[PDB]
Structures are given as C-alpha cells and as structure tokens.
Design a protein around this ligand. Structure first.
Ligand SMILES: *[C@@H]1O[C@H](CO)[C@@H](O)[C@H](O)[C@H]1NC(C)=O
Lengths: 40, 49
C-alpha cells in the first residue's frame, strides 16, 4: 500500500480541430455575408 | 451525433469490469446487515485457512 499499490476514446480528441475549423469557417463566412450585403 | 454514437460504441468495446468486493479488509466483511442482501461465504472445515 505504501509503494506497490500506490500508482502514479474521449471527447477532447474529436473536438479541437473540428471546433477550430468551424470557427474559421464562421470567421470567413461573416465576411462573405458582409460582401453579399455590400452586393445587395 | 456521429462522434457521440462512435464514442458510445467504443465505450461498449472498451469494456471494463467492476467487482463487488475488492479487499479482504472490506466494510462488507464487517456485517452483512450493512447492505440489504446478506451475502455469504465459508471455508473448508478443519483447514489451514
Ligand atoms: C473436523 O474436526 C472435528 C474435531 O472434533 C472432528 O470431529 C471432525 O470429524 C472433523 N471433520 C470435519 C467435519 O471436517
């Protein structure tokens, strides 16, 4: 219990690049929407 | 949704197993009235155990 027994997939993997890519798509898409507002 | 269903399927695949008693010094080994089913265990008679 002093040394032997004492020692020292998930959703974090499939969220980071997806969140950053959707965030970059939103940042590009807002500018494209303002270009379309300037078009109409 | 696809990622969450894949997570549930992989968590079924990553199948661990908990145990009822994980120690000879268990609190269940004090009194079987501590929980609602009184469990039972014996030994061999006249044995070294
Ligand atoms: C165990 O020990 C007792 C001691 O009296 C003996 O009578 C009996 O025959 C032995 N056999 C059993 C039940 O294991």
């Amino acid at each position: 219990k002093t040394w032997v027994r004492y020692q020292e997939t998930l959703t974090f993997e499939n969220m980071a690049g997806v969140f950053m890519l959707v965030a970059g798509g939103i940042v590009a898409g807002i500018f494209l929407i303002f270009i379309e507002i300037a078009y109409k | 949704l696809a990622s969450y269903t894949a997570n549930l399927a992989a968590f079924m695949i990553q199948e661990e197993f908990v145990d009822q008693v994980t120690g000879l010094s268990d609190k269940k080994f004090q009194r079987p009235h501590d929980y609602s089913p009184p469990f039972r265990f014996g030994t061999v008679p006249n044995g070294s155990t």
